[PDB]
Paper text:
ACh is synthesized in the cytosol, and its active transport into synaptic vesicles is mediated by vesicular acetylcholine transporter (VAChT or SLC18A3).2 Remarkably, VAChT plays a vital role in ACh neurotransmission. To assist in the structure determination, we attached a maltose binding protein (MBP) tag to the N-terminus of human VAChT and an MBP-specific binder, a designed ankyrin repeat protein (DARPin), to its C-terminus; this strategy was similar to that reported in our structural study on VMAT2. To investigate the inhibitory mechanism of vesamicol and guide subsequent efforts to develop drugs, we determined the cryo-electron microscopy (cryo-EM) structure of human VAChT in complex with vesamicol or its native substrate ACh.
Subsequently, we determined the cryo-EM structure of the VAChTEM/vesamicol complex at a 3.5 Å resolution by local refinement, which was focused on the transporter portion. In this structure, VAChT adopts a major facilitator superfamily fold in a lumen-facing conformation. The additional EM density in the central cavity of VAChT fits well with the structure of D-(+)-vesamicol, whose binding pose was further validated by molecular dynamics (MD) simulations. Vesamicol binds to a negatively charged pocket of VAChT, which can accommodate the positively charged alkylamine group in vesamicol. Moreover, the hydroxyl group of the cyclohexanol ring is engaged by Asn302 and Asp398 via hydrogen bonds, further stabilizing the binding of vesamicol. In addition to its competitive nature, vesamicol may bind and stabilize VAChT in its lumen-facing conformation, thereby arresting the transport cycle; this process is akin to how tetrabenazine inhibits VMAT2.9 In this context, vesamicol functions partially as an allosteric inhibitor.
Residue numbers in the entry: 20 to 61, 122 to 265, 277 to 474
């Protein structure tokens, strides 16, 4: 029964991959579906979104050690449990402060669930040409839940309210957590004090910060830019993030296939992604109809797809080779990067586009990414 054992090992491993990708879908669906529905229930709302992400910046440098002290199935149980808590706290509560605590809770739940989920995808796929494939499918479900879910959330919020959508989504969350319990049934690490002084973790964390900063700044800012420049409406600005899903995954496929064909200069096909985000940093403020802004955001999701799918596998490869082979603290560093982007986002984005303008924010993205894109030369001989 050895070959039955190996096949069933592959079945449990693929089931854990699919279940963790669907948990990532549920979490990102929660995030990008509750972004529009909050201002029905009053400055102090940008601080709600950034308090989610800044709470996440609070808990994941602490959660990173608390993830590496334990097999990762239990800190994904914790993550989907507080996902269920936050989601029913959306569905039954309507006050701004319970909404605030639910969004914040979700911040800690993103820390636990997303960090341990990407971490056990990196564990359970130790071989590199299938690690990059599994992290690419993780990115695929994250982009699905972050891009095609605001259309489903719009069509089930201004046609079904918020009680029954978030209770059926809480049902899928609890069922995915209990299915993870049905399929998984659950040494010392590198300190963050020793990861933050490493140059290679620091340049990849700056890469994740800088590639997440346009999706940080634009998402509460694209709406008022539609209103000011393009004169948009309900049906227009809400599904202008949908058509950027299909390039994203396709871009993922490139930096999955090229992970196996030419794995030499992967940092090239990391930094190239950042460079085309710089193309986004040129092409966003000159869009004359719906199609140029759609293809600009397609390029934006395309570039961050390339950057995440080419820099999450080499992040686990970096903590494999240079450090001890645990994956909780290093994707806690990745999620600190994601979190500091989405925490600097909604506080300052709207007020600088009120004050300075929007071309100043696009040229700020240009200055940041074009002062950062040759810093990926620091990974020059790592791929050996
Ligand atoms: O930095 C990455 C690693 C940490 C966890 C998830 C992060 N990443 C964030 C943006 C997300 C995204 C956003 C918009 C469209 C498509 C996809 C892709 C995943």
């Amino acid at each position: 029964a050895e070959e039955e054992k190996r096949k069933a090992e592959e079945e449990k491993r693929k089931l854990v991959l699919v279940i963790v990708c669907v948990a990532l879908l549920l979490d990102n669906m929660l995030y990008m579906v509750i972004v529009p529905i909050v201002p029905d229930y009053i400055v102090k709302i940008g601080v709600l979104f950034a308090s989610k992400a800044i709470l996440q910046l609070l808990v994941n440098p602490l959660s990173g050690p608390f993830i590496d002290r334990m097999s990762y199935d239990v800190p994904l149980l914790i993550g989907l449990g507080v996902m269920f808590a936050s989601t029913v706290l959306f569905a039954f509560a309507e006050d701004y402060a319970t909404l605030f605590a639910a969004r914040s809770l979700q911040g800690l739940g993103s820390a636990f669930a997303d960090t341990s989920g990407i971490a056990m995808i990196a564990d359970k796929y130790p071989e590199e040409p299938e690690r990059s494939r599994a992290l690419g499918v993780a990115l695929a479900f994250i982009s699905f839940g972050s891009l095609v879910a605001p259309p489903f959330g719009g069509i089930l919020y201004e046609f079904a309210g918020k009680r029954v959508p978030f209770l059926v989504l809480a049902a899928v969350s609890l069922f995915d957590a209990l299915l993870l319990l049905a399929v998984a049934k659950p040494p010392v690490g590198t300190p963050i004090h020793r990861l933050m002084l490493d140059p290679y973790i620091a340049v990849v964390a700056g890469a994740l910060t800088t590639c997440n900063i346009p999706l940080a700044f634009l998402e509460p800012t694209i709406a008022t830019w539609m209103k000011h420049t393009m004169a948009a409406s309900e049906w227009e600005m809400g599904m202008a993030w949908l058509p950027a899903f299909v390039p994203h995954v396709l871009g993922v496929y490139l930096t999955v296939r090229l992970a196996a064909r030419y794995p030499h200069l992967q940092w090239l096909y990391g930094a190239l992604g950042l460079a085309v985000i710089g193309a986004s940093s040129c092409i966003v403020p000159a869009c004359r109809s719906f199609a140029p802004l759609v293809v600009s955001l397609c390029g934006l999701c395309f570039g961050i797809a390339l950057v995440d799918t080419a820099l999450l596998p080499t992040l686990a490869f970096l903590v494999d080779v240079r450090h001890v082979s645990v994956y909780g603290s290093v994707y806690a560093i990745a999620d600190i990067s994601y979190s500091v982007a989405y925490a600097l986002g909604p506080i300052v984005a709207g007020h600088i586009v009120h004050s300075l303008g929007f071309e100043q924010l696009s040229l700020g993205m240009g200055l940041a990414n074009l002062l950062y894109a040759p810093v990926l030369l620091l990974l020059r001989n790592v791929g050996l």
